[PDB]
Design a protein around this ligand. Structure first.
Ligand code: APC
Ligand code: MG
Ligand code: MG
Length: 829
DNA sequence: GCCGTGCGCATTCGCCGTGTT
DNA sequence: TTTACGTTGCGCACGGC
RNA sequence: ACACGGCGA
């Protein structure tokens, strides 16, 4: 509907959608920009009125420029104090202790902190501040240094946890309590500190010229240029982080790596690929990938609308003292009552941090929903992350949590129909949790609950239960439409997005490109009686282990009892799950310990439902090994294919130098590959250019490299290998997601799409076809091309030799008949 | 240059907020 | 200016044989 | 670009 000519907004929108909607749209983009700067200012202020200006990006561009000059004046002073044949100022004494880096930084930093915080910025105050600042380091890195790794394990793992420059200076007193060898610390006295700062105050004036000294004991100020600059940099930053909101008209079609989504032509347009380096983005500048541009476009032309009935419930039910949906964050704290009582009521704090923060988005989402109710429809611009996965641009989108998705329904519905009705019951059965049983038992769930559904539909307020299902608001959303069908019949116009979501798309994709039948089997890639749940399969396997006590259970010096603790907890698919999908991505046994500990124990601990683990560790380490054993003997080809990708990344990331005269024969280099739909991916992680240096309290800061070397930035051979596997398949599903949107649209005429990476959705009337579209695409894709062989050919002849050829062979293909996916009921994606 | 003592890294990606009591 | 139990196996490095 | 909480996958 728009060709290369639409260059002047408003004129294009109005003579296309009416100037009434053209204005609203533009009004909105601009507001997004407005709310952005607003959100910025509010912060740039809370930091200003909190001595943390040095932390704001607005100062960084300056700090970087004055930091070197300082340390370049700090040293010169020293050597010069050495030329002096006599006594040395007390400054050289209480300043040679800490690194000449911390010194300067803590200087510039602190000097700005208390000279932008209050209005009593005097030499006595600032200096005293820098003094306590310089002393609050004074090379007492007793643990950070002196080869006392105890810091990089039991002293650092916490400081980075404790929030606030107040609790880090306080909680640090803890570590100090314990002897830790050595001991005692002569206080710089409240008279040497000032002097320590004095010299520091100087040198800064001697070099940076930043601060200035009035002539009204003497006040401290900032130069008209080094003050206007952080206020300039601010204004800059302020308008480059807009709180993007949905659109009141179809998004602007993408025709290039930039300018898509919103119509307002601003200085910072939207980019198609969420890249980090502008260089990375320009890499797409001329790549021909029509099918990619079409998925993104088609997908963003999906007209959505607020689900008023679902909004009605949500609006009031989320204020409720006691919400019937144990998922929503309460309005108030978690009391406080329930080593001292506090021992058990310690998590209360952090658990409320999750609540208040989870509460903020909840309210923002509700703000957007209500804000956009009444609009005949709304759209979401779309772009990708760099592996090619599709993301809605605005904070509020059909990809958000339960309530979010519940608050949204497709704008263009159609008479539901026989099949559409069927597919909806299925949807409802899914929203309810009844989704790991064959389709017939699901319809039975919906039908055998007819009355509960109507009830919740009549007085959602009065009749909860819908709020006792896994997907409460979505289920609710379904209850409504279901009731509508009852009151109106199969000609009922329904626009409820019916979600078709693959079962572990990760292993499915691996199983696909490898024809892995065992894996495919597990992840429903073949027609089957009951739905295969690979997580349940691993859950059942773990259980057999647990069930075994003596053969696997030992005495406590132990297992046995340990297993019993779990058997008591009742280990199910809930656990081990994350561990099952990340194995083929690189997650190891140590990874599981953390996962199971953080995903199952940690949450089950502070709640009461799980207080029989006696120390989570070991109890988690234990599970970690069963999950490994159980999963390792389940996911095979996948892993093999994973290690094959790691070798290519490892090899390419490597920097080969000649054995006899080591000049670099081949330079480190990114792994490159093209997704089936024509979408190019460039994975080239980089090791931080400016090495960073912490200071425990004041924070962290970088600094221009010492050794003149940083031409490119230095590729991170480690990340390149740990990401390659996950990034690759992700780019395989994203392409699969895009391939399906285009396929479903051109072959089936589908206009509405509810996309969520490996989740495909439409209105009931088109579900049948999306059910086929996805699958047909899965099949045609992995049958038309060998993604691993094509990947090889991509780096094979290209940068790869100079000895390099320890490249494991492409995995042997399985006996899986891809075409079967077409007959698989549980595959979905 | 064969196989030993050792510091580092635990899967990836996207993005919002407050930095406190 | 008063919340925070605690943990483990492959690998690339600077290296004396 | 490194840190805390959350949400998403
Ligand atoms: N933690 C993670 N690490 C890497 N990739 C992840 C990930 N979480 C999600 N992904 C990807 O995002 C997809 C969608 O995420 P999920 O829906 O959480 C998975 P699922 O495999 O359908 O499990 P389910 O049976 O528990 O719902 C996954 O299938 C996977 O490809
Ligand atoms: Mg899924
Ligand atoms: Mg999913």
């Amino acid at each position: 509907s728009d060709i290369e000519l639409a260059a002047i907004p408003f004129n294009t929108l109005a003579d296309h959608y009416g100037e009434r909607l053209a204005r609203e749209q533009l009004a909105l983009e601009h507001e997004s920009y407005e709310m952005g700067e607003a959100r910025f200012r509010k912060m740039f202020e809370r930091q200003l009125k909190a001595g943390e200006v040095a932390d704001n990006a607005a100062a960084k561009p300056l700090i970087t420029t004055l930091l070197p000059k300082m340390i370049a004046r700090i040293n010169d002073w020293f050597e010069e104090v050495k030329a002096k044949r006599g006594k040395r100022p007390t400054a050289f004494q209480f300043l040679q202790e800490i690194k000449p880096e911390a010194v300067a930084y803590i200087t510039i930093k602190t000097t700005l902190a208390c000279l932008t915080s209050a209005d009593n910025t005097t030499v006595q105050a600032v200096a005293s501040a820098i003094g306590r600042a310089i002393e609050d380091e004074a090379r007492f890195g007793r643990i950070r240094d002196l080869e006392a790794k105890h810091f990089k394990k039991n002293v650092e793992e916490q400081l980075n946890k404790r929030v606030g420059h107040v609790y880090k200076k306080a909680f640090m007193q803890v570590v100090e309590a314990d002897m830790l060898s050595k001991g005692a610390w002569s206080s710089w006295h409240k008279e040497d500190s000032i002097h320590v700062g004095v010299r520091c105050i100087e040198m800064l004036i001697e070099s940076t010229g930043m601060v200035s000294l009035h002539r009204q004991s003497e006040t401290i100020e900032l130069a008209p240029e080094y003050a206007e600059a952080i206020a300039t940099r601010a204004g800059a930053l302020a308008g480059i982080s807009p709180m993007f909101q949905p659109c009141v008209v179809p998004p602007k079609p993408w025709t290039g790596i930039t300018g898509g989504g919103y119509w307002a032509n601003g200085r910072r347009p939207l980019a198609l690929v969420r890249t980090h380096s502008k260089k990375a983005l320009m890499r797409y500048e001329d790549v021909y990938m029509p099918e990619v541009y079409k998925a993104i476009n088609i997908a963003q032309n999906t007209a959505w609308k607020i689900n008023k009935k679902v909004l009605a419930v949500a609006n009031v039910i989320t204020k409720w003292k006691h919400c019937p949906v144990e998922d929503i964050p309460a309005i108030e704290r978690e009391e406080l009552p329930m080593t001292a009582w506090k021992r058990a009521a310690a998590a209360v704090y952090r658990k409320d941090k999750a609540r208040k923060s989870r509460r903020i988005s909840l309210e923002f989402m509700l703000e957007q929903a209500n804000k956009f109710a009444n609009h005949k429809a709304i759209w979401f611009p779309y772009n990708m992350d760099w592996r090619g996965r599709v993301y809605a641009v605005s904070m509020f989108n059909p990809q958000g949590n339960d309530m979010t998705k519940g608050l949204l329904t497709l704008a263009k519905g159609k008479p539901i129909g026989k099949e559409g009705y069927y597919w909806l019951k299925i949807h409802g059965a899914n929203c309810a949790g009844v989704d790991k049983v064959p389709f017939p038992e699901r319809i039975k769930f919906i039908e055998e609950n007819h009355e509960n559904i109507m009830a919740c539909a009549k007085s959602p307020l009065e009749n909860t239960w819908w709020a006792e299902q896994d997907s409460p608001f979505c289920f609710l959303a379904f209850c409504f439409e279901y009731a509508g069908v009852q009151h109106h019949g199969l000609s009922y116009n329904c626009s409820l997005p019916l979600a078709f979501d693959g079962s572990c798309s990760g292993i499915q994709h691996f199983s696909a490109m490898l024809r892995d039948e065992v894996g495919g089997r597990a992840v429903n890639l073949l027609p089957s009686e009951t739905v295969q749940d690979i997580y349940g399969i691993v859950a059942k396997k773990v259980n057999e282990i647990l069930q075994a006590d003596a053969i696997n259970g030992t005495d406590n010096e132990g297992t046995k009892a340990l297993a019993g603790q779990w058997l008591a907890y009742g280990v199910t698919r809930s656990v081990t799950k994350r561990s099952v999908m990340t194995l083929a991505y690189g997650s190891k046994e140590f990874g599981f310990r953390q996962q199971v500990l953080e995903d199952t124990i940690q949450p089950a601990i502070d709640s009461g439902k799980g207080l029989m683990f006696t120390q989570p560790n070991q109890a988690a380490g234990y599970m970690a090994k069963l999950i490994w054993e159980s999963v390792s003997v389940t996911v095979v080809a996948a892993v093999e294919a994973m290690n094959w990708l790691k070798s290519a990344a490892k090899l390419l990331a490597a920097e080969v130098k000649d054995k006899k005269t080591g000049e670099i024969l081949r330079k480190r280099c990114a792994v490159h590959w093209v997704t089936p739909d024509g979408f190019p991916v460039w994975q080239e992680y980089k090791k931080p250019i400016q090495t960073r240096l912490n200071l425990m309290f004041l924070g962290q800061f970088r600094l221009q490299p010492t050794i003149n070397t940083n031409k490119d930035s230095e590729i991170d051979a480690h990340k390149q290998e740990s990401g390659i596997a996950p990034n690759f398949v992700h780019s395989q599903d994203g392409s699969h997601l895009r391939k399906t949107v285009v396929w479903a649209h051109e072959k089936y005429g589908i206009e509405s799409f509810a996309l969520i990476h490996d989740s495909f959705g439409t209105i009931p009337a088109d579900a049948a076809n999306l059910f086929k579209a996805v699958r047909e695409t899965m099949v045609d894709t992995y049958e038309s091309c060998d993604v691993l062989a094509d990947f090889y050919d991509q780096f094979a002849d290209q940068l790869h030799e100079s000895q390099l050829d320890k490249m494991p062979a492409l995995p042997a293909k399985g006996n899986l008949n891809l075409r079967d996916i077409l007959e698989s009921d549980f595959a979905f994606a």
